[PDB]
Amino acid sequence: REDALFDIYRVMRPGEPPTVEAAEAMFKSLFFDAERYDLSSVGRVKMNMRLE
DNA sequence: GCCCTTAGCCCCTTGACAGGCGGGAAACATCGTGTTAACCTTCGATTAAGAGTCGCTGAGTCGCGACG
């Protein structure tokens, strides 16, 4: 999982040097964080309808 | 009809202002510095639902042969 986090950090921010906790925090803030990945309720309902 | 005399116009000489660009002298609003030391020593967007092609890189497959 550390290698996957490093790869994700390099893909998103190639210039910045990926770190163990920095890469894990980047993915969380990108997708696991509701502050940035603010998917509306219409998106969630559309996902629930498309894939049950 | 021509010459003399006098009047009007044009020109010259002086001048008493009027103020008027402009540097100086001065009173006043800028423009580049400093300086202070009580706490955090990775901030953040933004394509990515069409499309013809230029410029580079790095993987899997083969020949030629040597040493048992």
From Swiss-Prot:
It comes from the Bacteria. The RNAP catalytic core consists of 2 alpha, 1 beta, 1 beta' and 1 omega subunit. When a sigma factor is associated with the core the holoenzyme is formed, which can initiate transcription. DNA-dependent RNA polymerase catalyzes the transcription of DNA into RNA using the four ribonucleoside triphosphates as substrates. Belongs to the RNA polymerase beta chain family. This is DNA-directed RNA polymerase subunit beta. It comes from Caulobacter vibrioides (strain NA1000 / CB15N) (Caulobacter crescentus).
